[PDB]
RNA sequence: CGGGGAAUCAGGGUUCGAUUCCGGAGAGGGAGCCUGAGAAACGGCUACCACAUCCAAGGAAGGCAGCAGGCGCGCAAAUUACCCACUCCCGACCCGGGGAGGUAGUGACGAAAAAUAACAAUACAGGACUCUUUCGAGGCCCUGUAAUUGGAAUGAGUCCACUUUAAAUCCUUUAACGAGGAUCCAUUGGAGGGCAAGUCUGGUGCCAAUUCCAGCUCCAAUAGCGUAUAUUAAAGUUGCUGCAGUUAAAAAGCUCGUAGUUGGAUCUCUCUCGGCCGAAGCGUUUACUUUGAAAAAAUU
């Protein structure tokens, strides 16, 4: 069991120190190498230049052909594949466009429907996709 | 090593940017072409084109006048052109060549319906860098000049979401406008960059 | 370095469970016969009660003859009697835990105007306070949630500069009489 | 859509109350921004 | 209701001694110079580049 | 950068503190100094290194991690405004000066209050009550709902004045005008698989099921509401309080063994000098508990 001596603070403190590392949530935030390989660099959003347009197939029990974009981030040069809200919203994106990109929603894990894509596009050419799709604004090219 | 590696990347990126900013408008590049487009019938374009004019070399045509401006102190060479909205082959032809568009705005409303038509044409073709100038904010009473500037920034926000409005009233503010136009990041259009024009 | 004060509070707390059928209906019942605008005026009165209840249960764990319990227990009970939520004969720290939200909401200026016969409904009371038709003692009040002390209860007058008070007719009556 | 149906019928096996099976069972309501 | 402060002086001479410059100017007993801070500050820095009586010649 | 301190909070904690108060360090990187009471001072000087301005090409000059402002970087942050009137500081000084500091501008970081209607009549629908066994009657009440009427009340605004203030603005006070679709028009999200809320409608195609799109109806919060990310609680999924290790993640192949941790019972004040006291060896040394002092405000 656990030692319950009055003068056992050093062993009780040192043991909890080492056993924290064995939780993967504690190691990711504290080792630092989970923020080095993060494309966002510990940020919440990131801007990038659109390279091309691609399509991603869905999972086996729910077959679909989802359409994504290949965007290269500015501040670190990494390539990420981002998701667009529908096929209708792809009309407002052309290559070599500056897009603001967020995460899809589960802190690093993919969509429950389509694998391989982890990021969603928020803005294109400094206007938002919600205002473009609802006809509130027009984008410059 | 981490600090030295960071300063090595910063030394690379700043020399790349310094090359690109110096190559336009300087002594080793083409003139910085500015197109001045009013967006209302209440804006006196010859009054605004008077304020922008360093030494001046005034070229002119049958109807319009496009003058060359050279600033030796500020080390920047200008080519100022103007275009009334509503004549499509006038505005669209010289905006696809321009590096900067200067929009002139009504103090009271945002822009005329003709200016609304012109903006839809420029947005679809492709904008270069743009700067918004309000021409007649001093004609209004001084009490409302804070209040009417508050109302104007609402009517602009439907199309230009987060952009500062300048003033074209005096020669001082004209000098502030030239420095803003000279030192400003340039929007690189994809089409005209790949071809020689 | 500025000569400013940055101290500020929140006067409400959102509940943990946002959608439960029992809490949604007890709150809607309180908005109904007290004429409130949102749930925030329910959660605000709920929050000011828990602050009092926390102060009561902190003093109760102290022993009876503790001089901080005697000073601040008497101070707390005097403040509740003064706003009229406690009876005079119920001055003890054990009776504080028997208060409810409805005792605090009954002391608002919106409720007192309806209870004093100055208005025809609880919603008519609220618009009458806001339109500068109600004064307390000699001071016009716009705030419906103004908590009325016992000394101000019998002095809720009816605004000498109002059409319903001294007698200067309103904009509508003046415009209408000009037609004929 | 077919993944929703097998999860509904699994809940039907568990005996809890379910909404009836209709045409609108698995349908995306609107795009999500 | 209205709350304010007031003060009554013994004479007009003592009022001109113990009062601020702005309160007398509200009554018309004092007039201030019309120079903005920029005109004084740029002139001040202009004559610190000049040594001698030519300080008084600065525009 | 440290600390006061912030968030969360049954209790124990966990996470944060570049940031207005206190201490430190620095002025592009290093180094050496002059003057002075006090500086290794950079809105002082002298060099080197890295940048960079003017030129008649010999030379001269520089340091915004001060207030604005610009470029760059970026997911990411405001005016090249007015004043020493307030608070204080400096000076030879009651007088001069202060981008310290104050006042306006931008400001949905966040926090507090709080409009977008109310009442009366008419018509239907429910619930009581009087008379009737009941159906039923109530110029009997009460409460709702209106493609129904009706004048009563008011702010939002436009715009004199007074007040405010260094001069203004805002608020507060008030003349005048200012509401029926009171069009002076409240949004943001979610629901037909679980928590609040769907036996819906119309286009689009596969061999009745079924890809995509546009709506209706309902629910929630409301001048606000979604999304991403970090973190706290949920988490008794880091466990001191307070978890586990047969079969689910896990106990070492066996024993000896330093440090560490833990360790059976037992034990009921005084001697001299000075006015009953004061000085003094104190009495084996502790840990524990209680009391007293001393401890910056602001925050709580």
PDB file of C-alpha atoms (C1' of nucleotides) in Angstrom, chain F residues 11 21 26 59 93 106 164 170 175 193-194 207 213 267 292 294:
ATOM      1  C1'   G F  11     -12.764  19.789   1.891  1.00  0.00           C
ATOM      2  C1'   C F  21       1.779  48.368  -6.194  1.00  0.00           C
ATOM      3  C1'   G F  26      18.006  46.458 -19.475  1.00  0.00           C
ATOM      4  C1'   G F  59      34.030  64.436 -43.884  1.00  0.00           C
ATOM      5  C1'   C F  93      10.850  79.649  -7.593  1.00  0.00           C
ATOM      6  C1'   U F 106     -11.080  54.421 -31.272  1.00  0.00           C
ATOM      7  C1'   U F 164     -20.395  70.334 -17.020  1.00  0.00           C
ATOM      8  C1'   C F 170     -21.025  62.672 -22.376  1.00  0.00           C
ATOM      9  C1'   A F 175     -38.253  74.910 -24.026  1.00  0.00           C
ATOM     10  C1'   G F 193     -30.110   8.750 -32.991  1.00  0.00           C
ATOM     11  C1'   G F 194     -29.510  10.380 -26.041  1.00  0.00           C
ATOM     12  C1'   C F 207     -31.450  -0.821 -57.172  1.00  0.00           C
ATOM     13  C1'   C F 213     -29.897  21.770 -51.716  1.00  0.00           C
ATOM     14  C1'   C F 267       8.765   6.337  35.398  1.00  0.00           C
ATOM     15  C1'   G F 292       1.791  37.909  22.845  1.00  0.00           C
ATOM     16  C1'   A F 294       6.316  42.383  14.783  1.00  0.00           C
TER      17        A F 294
END
